Amino acid sequence: TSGTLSPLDIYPKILDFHPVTMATFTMTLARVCLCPMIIGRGNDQVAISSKFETREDIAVIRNYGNLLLEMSAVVPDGIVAFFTSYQYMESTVASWYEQGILENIQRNKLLFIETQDGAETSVALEKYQEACENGRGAILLSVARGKVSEGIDFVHHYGRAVIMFGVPYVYTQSRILKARLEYLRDQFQIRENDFLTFDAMRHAAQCVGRAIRGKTDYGLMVFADKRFARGDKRGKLPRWIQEHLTDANLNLTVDEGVQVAKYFLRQMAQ
Amino acid sequence: DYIYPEQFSYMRELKRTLDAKGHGVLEMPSGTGKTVSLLALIMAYQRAYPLEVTKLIYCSRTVPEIEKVIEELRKLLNFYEKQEGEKLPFLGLALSSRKNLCIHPEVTPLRFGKDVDGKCHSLTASYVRAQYQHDTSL
Amino acid sequence: EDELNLLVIVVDANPIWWGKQTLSKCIDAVMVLGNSHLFMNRSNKLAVIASHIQESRFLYPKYELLTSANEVIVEEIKDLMTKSDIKGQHTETLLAGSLAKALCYIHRMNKEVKDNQEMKSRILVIKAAEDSALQYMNFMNVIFAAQKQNILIDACVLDSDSGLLQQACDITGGLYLKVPQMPSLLQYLLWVF
Amino acid sequence: RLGMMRHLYVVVDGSRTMEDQDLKPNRLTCTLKLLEYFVEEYFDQNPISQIGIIVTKSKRAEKLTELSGNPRKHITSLKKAVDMTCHGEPSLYNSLSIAMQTLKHMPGHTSREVLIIFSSLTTCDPSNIYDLIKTLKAAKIRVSVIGLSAEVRVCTVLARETGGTYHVILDESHYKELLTHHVSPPPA
């Protein structure tokens, strides 16, 4: 088990065995959750080609840095921004400590960098739970692979929104891993989506899963990427089916920021 | 003396999902309720066969998640016996590496060629030697 | 008209009316007001009670009934006029008693109505008199009962100072008006509430 | 209703976040306007009572009305405040200390109450706020918060520990319902 797993196939794919299947909990309506995507809002919003997202300065500066600042300043709640690497995280938030003078976010957020310390981690979670935007799980940056994924077992709904600045993705080292990719090409042919993309999206889903916790809570989770439709197919993220009666978990809108603030009013009302 | 409406709805199908005696896959919530409801769903089989009684083992990524499994399971049992307990007369335990549980054995034999297996062998050897004779010095 | 409405009017009988020097006129005006109230809707009902110095008494208990109501009121008040409790012989009136009677009636009417749907009721006091300390517990008991019942107690003070009544409206969420120009009584009854 | 006497300190958020058009042009206008409606309804329900008015703005606390039994001062103060508006960030600890200082003086059978309208997310005060919450519960000063779209944990604990009234408001209709619940008296 893994909480969600409804598309079923990946586990029998990994096993080379066909377990007995069963869904063995009663789920809650789709409406307590909201799962957005962001890419731009006018036809001039061309800086997100992501042919070299690790090098595209204009793209980092435009909706990657600017949409985060618009969403965080407008939606004033405790929100953690997950990144694909430290290097992206460092470039996107100028912070108190900047990698260059030329970086494009100016706002009070907290860091979560390497040499994390078990005692130091708690200080940042004490700050996020207590008050203000900033803390661990609050207006703070962390890489999605990193320790923040363990979360905290507080009763208080410490988390509100998570904004994945880039879809969590991984690579395949030109050694034993490359040998594995070849083997699974030989056997599956459809190896890339199973071996890497789907496996990275679950990496995503753990962090968002840790934010919203279960049926007795509420939340939203946004993804920032050009290639995001591919991620929406095959039910590789939490958005997918659990009960036909639920009346769907749809996220299309002409403006994400407005839709989440309208959704938070809806949640206060409940 | 009861259990959840969810456990009652699911139980027969879950006992059946379990009958195949080799494997199965289970869909559950994003975390809250998942592990406790497993313990509630294994309460149906806590003694399925009296002549052998099978056991439960739980695999876990890190030490803070293990205390979440223990604290929930401690609430569900409430005690080992009918004297204070009402779902499971079970006995449960946490464990993790010798590398985590024990600091002094890591510290004292400080050398590069000193594997965590080897240190239990070393501690066992000092205990047998002390028992043999050398309690006063080894 | 869907909702049955009972308006109970408590009239303070106190000889303060002498200061008013007229009671006859006040009755005429109150009658006009009642007729209008009954005419507005089929479902409207009225009960009239007199809070006198010595005790509280029921003057009357539908609009078809109005002719009956007029006669019953004129006759009842005349009987009340008696010398005892004359002029400011007794400054206060038995409002607590009157309110108790009113709540009993409202309750009884409500039970019958309960068989059917809900009833809405409100109590109107025409207050001439002054409050007294001895009165505090009894009056407040009735007032609080009304508030719990969610029955508004409105008060029109022609004269005198009944603080308890002012408090009664506040707690009850009713309306309190100290009338300047008592002859404008009819306007206040229609307009004020 | 009569039976006992109330002392209530009304505390309003005059931070820059209160300017926003989300609830009546700028939360400030909609909250002061409904708060004027509440004062007259609370004083009508509670004829023997007192209120005092405090604001938090530009990282300080200021006294809009002194503690008194005449409603007129408080509606006149809510009228006079609207013109000078809101800017900056809260000062909740200094506002609970001035409110405490007035409320501690009051005698045995009267209530000690603080009503806060909150549109921020923290407060600028250095002092340890947990020591002051412990002291409120010893003093029997009860603190209530009506928050705008906001659940930030120190405020919610602070209202629970002092007596149990952290409420969220999402419309002008919901805010009138919340103030009208506070108009309601305590048992005696």
Task: Map out the domains of chain A as residue ranges.
Answer: 34-269
Q: Cβ D1–C167 below 8 Å, yes or no?
A: yes
- Three-state DSSP class for B102? coil
Spatial CA neighbour of C116 closest among C39, C2, C8 = C2
- Dihedral angle sign, alpha carbons of residues C69, C74, C79, C84: positive
Domain A34-269 belongs in CATH node 3.40.50.300: yes
Q: Are B34 and A1 in contact (CB under 8 A)?
A: yes
In chain B, helix, strand, coil percent, each to 5? 50, 5, 45
Q: Does A22 reach chain B within 8 Å, measured CB to CB?
A: yes
Q: Cβ D1–C173 below 8 Å, yes or no?
A: no
- Dihedral angle sign, alpha carbons of residues A191, A195, A197, A202: positive
Resolution in A: 6.3
Nearest CA in chain A to B18: A20
Q: Which residue has the tokens 């229609």?
A: C190
End-to-end CA distance of chain A: 31
Token output for D154: 């120190």
Q: Are A8 and A21 in contact (CB under 8 A)?
A: yes
Contacts of A238 in chain B (CB under 8 A): 30
**Beta carbons within 8 Å of A244's beta carbon, 6+ residues apart:** none
Spatial CA neighbour of D1 closest among D52, D34, D49 = D49
For residue A190, the Cα-to-chain-centroid distance in whole angstroms is 24
Token output for A118: 């078990």
Q: Which amino acid is at C163?
A: G
Q: Are C88 and C15 in contact (CB under 8 A)?
A: yes
Question: C23-40 and C66-80 helices cross at what angle (nearest 10)?
Answer: 150
Which helix (H) or strand (E) is D8 found in, with range?
strand D6-13
Q: List beta partners, residue A20.
A: B24
Q: Cβ B30–A209 below 8 Å, yes or no?
A: yes
- CA D67 to CA D23: how far, in whole Å? 29
Spatial CA neighbour of D90 closest among D179, D14, D145 = D14
Token output for A69: 């600042």
Q: Which residue has the tokens 């408080």?
A: D74
Contacts of D47 in chain C (CB under 8 A): 166-167, 170
**Beta carbons within 8 Å of D18's beta carbon, 6+ residues apart:** D26, D27, D28, D31, D85, D86, D119
Question: From the candidates D15, D121, D148, which should be mutated to test the interface with A, based on the most A CB atoms within 10 A?
Answer: D121
Buried b (16+ CB within 10 A) or exposed e, D110-140: bbbbbbbbbbbbbbbbeeebeebbeebeeee
Token output for B10: 């699911």
Out of A8, A15, A215, whose CB is closest to B29?
A: A215
Q: How many CB atoms lie within 10 A of CB D22?
A: 16
Token output for C111: 């039970």
Q: Is B54 annotated as a binding residue?
A: no
Spatial CA neighbour of A5 closest among B39, B22, B32, B26 = B26
Q: What is the DSSP letter of A234?
A: G
Q: Is B59 annotated as a binding residue?
A: no
- Three-state DSSP class for C89? helix
Contacts of C171 in chain D (CB under 8 A): 1-2, 45
- CA D104 to CA C32: how far, in whole Å? 56
Closest chain C C-alpha to D42 CA, distance in angstroms: 9
Question: D28-45 and D172-183 helices cross at what angle (nearest 10)?
Answer: 30
Q: List beta partners, residue C60.
A: C48
Q: Are D114 and D144 in contact (CB under 8 A)?
A: yes
Dihedral angle of Cα B126, B129, B135, B136, to the nearest 10 degrees? -100
Q: Are C95 and C10 in contact (CB under 8 A)?
A: yes
Which helix (H) or strand (E) is D60 found in, with range?
strand D60-68
Spatial CA neighbour of C140 closest among B30, D80, D3 = D3
Q: Does B30 reach chain A within 8 Å, measured CB to CB?
A: yes
- CA A26 to CA C51: how far, in whole Å? 65
Q: How many CB atoms lie within 10 A of CB C62?
A: 12
Q: Is B30 annotated as a binding residue?
A: yes
In whole angstroms, how large is the CA radius of gyration of chain D? 15
Q: List beta partners, residue C7.
A: C46, C122
Residue D11: Cβ-neighbour burial (10 angstroms; 0-12, 13-18, 19+): buried
Give the pairing of strands A37-38 and A219-224: parallel
- Three-state DSSP class for B78? coil
DSSP B31-76: STTHHHHHHHHHGGGTTS-TTT--------SSHHHHHHHHHHHHHH
Q: Does B39 reach chain A within 8 Å, measured CB to CB?
A: no
DSSP A15-84: HTS-PEEEE-S----GGGEE--EE--SSTT------SSTTT-HHHIIIIIHHHHHHHHHHS-S-EEEEES
Counting every residue written for chain C, the total comes to: 193
Backbone torsions φ then ψ of D141, nearest 5 degrees: -95, 115
- Detail the DSSP E strand segments found in C13-65: 44-51, 56-60
- CA C105 to CA C98: how far, in whole Å? 11
DSSP D88-131: S---HHHHHHHHHHHHHHS-TTSEEEEEEEE-SSS----S-HHH
Q: Which residue has the tokens 């407060």?
A: D123
- CA B42 to CA A145: how far, in whole Å? 33
- Three-state DSSP class for A268? helix
Q: Number of A:B CB contacts under 8 A?
A: 88
Q: Are A103 and A131 in contact (CB under 8 A)?
A: no
Question: From the candidates A109, A130, A160, A218, which should be mutated to test the interface with D, based on the most D CB atoms within 10 A?
Answer: A130
Q: Is B29 annotated as a binding residue?
A: yes
- Dihedral angle sign, alpha carbons of residues A88, A81, A105, A167: positive
Dihedral angle of Cα B109, B115, B120, B124, to the nearest 10 degrees? -70
Can chain B be said to touch chain C, i.e. do they have 3 or more Cβ pairs within 8 angstroms?
Answer: no
Spatial CA neighbour of B4 closest among B46, B33, B45, B47 = B33
Q: Is B109 annotated as a binding residue?
A: no
Query: Subunits that touch chain C (at least 3 Cβ pairs < 8 angstroms)?
Result: D
Q: List beta partners, residue D62.
A: D55
Token output for B108: 């004292």
Q: Are D120 and D83 in contact (CB under 8 A)?
A: no
Q: Which alpha helices (H) appear in chain D, and where do they start and end?
A: 28-45, 71-84, 92-105, 129-139, 153-162, 172-183
Spatial CA neighbour of D77 closest among D41, D14, D35, D43 = D35
Q: Is B124 annotated as a binding residue?
A: no
